[PDB]
Symmetry: C3
Subunit: 134 residues, 3 copies
């Protein structure tokens, strides 16, 4: 069967949940967005499974992700009722001052497992502006 | 019963309408997002009911909200068929120059009254970058 | 017939596709968002039809649109089953540094043609901060 409007909204909420949880430093709600064997990849490496995702969460906060607002935009989703791909943008701004922090193109593979959508693979392609890359 | 996809879209449009009406300085469209018992809360305190909401529209514009683009992102909506809660982000940029203006975490309580969604309580938790807070 | 949720989501995806194709410099995916007689209007002028839209795409990239992220937000959509209008915000930021690039108010007229939504007219009202202005 086809992807429903409710499915699309739920998949978009995975991005919103990931980003908000990261900003709040809420590791449990962050981890909930991933499948048990889900993965996060960026220039920094790959974190896969819950233990590595948990460590990765703190590592990202420590290196570049703390004290920001990470915002998702331009979601495009394609797939069916249990497997889909999302492409979107990530823009990052500082909470403590009026500067920007970076941006990225994001590609997500998502899956419906036991009736709920989860991130299988999130790939973040960071734009060259990121201070950690300069 | 559960929220429909159209419900969730309509709830997200409340945020869009609030912010666009504020930026356009369209008081009537701003107020139409609120139920008669509606309230707005932030760093500045709370305004309840349309008399207070109308005055607060001008107060906010005159001190800090004028000349901007207020953008909503990362919407997460929970609820049932006639009551829901929305969590989202607000990022604010200047229309007249290339600077940022601020950001916030936003929590909305909404209700479906005679087939249409309204804001009952909007809580804005502004980030410390807001110039006014300096 | 009223718009369905799938309709509104697809209409939103036209904006996402437009902006993502512009940023990627993917002219074929950009053009696909428009009906054959579709039009884009901005302060720079109006391009109607796919050959004008194609020329306009590269003209924009060569002058102000290259090297950015064009993000859509605050989508409001009104309509029926085959004709709608969308109002939204466009914010633009630089990919190569941490500066902003500009913003705009966007108004789109869209139409469902053979079961798929297309842009008929997109009007971009750029805010005065744009360096090109
Ligand atoms: K920005």
């Amino acid at each position: 069967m086809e992807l429903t409007a409710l499915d699309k909204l739920e998949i978009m909420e995975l991005a919103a949940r990931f980003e908000m949880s990261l900003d709040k430093e809420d590791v449990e709600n962050y981890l909930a967005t991933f499948a048990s064997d889900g993965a996060l990849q960026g220039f920094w490496g790959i974190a896969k499974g819950k233990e590595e995702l948990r460590q990765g969460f703190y590592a990202m906060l420590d290196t570049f992700a703390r004290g920001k607002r990470h915002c998702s935009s331009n979601a495009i989703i394609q797939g069916n009722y249990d497997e889909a791909t999302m492409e979107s943008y990530l823009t990052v701004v500082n909470r403590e001052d009026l500067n920007r922090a970076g941006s990225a193109f994001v590609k997500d593979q998502v899956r419906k497992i036991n009736g709920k959508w989860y991130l299988i693979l999130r790939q973040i392609e960071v734009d060259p502006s990121l201070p950690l890359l300069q």
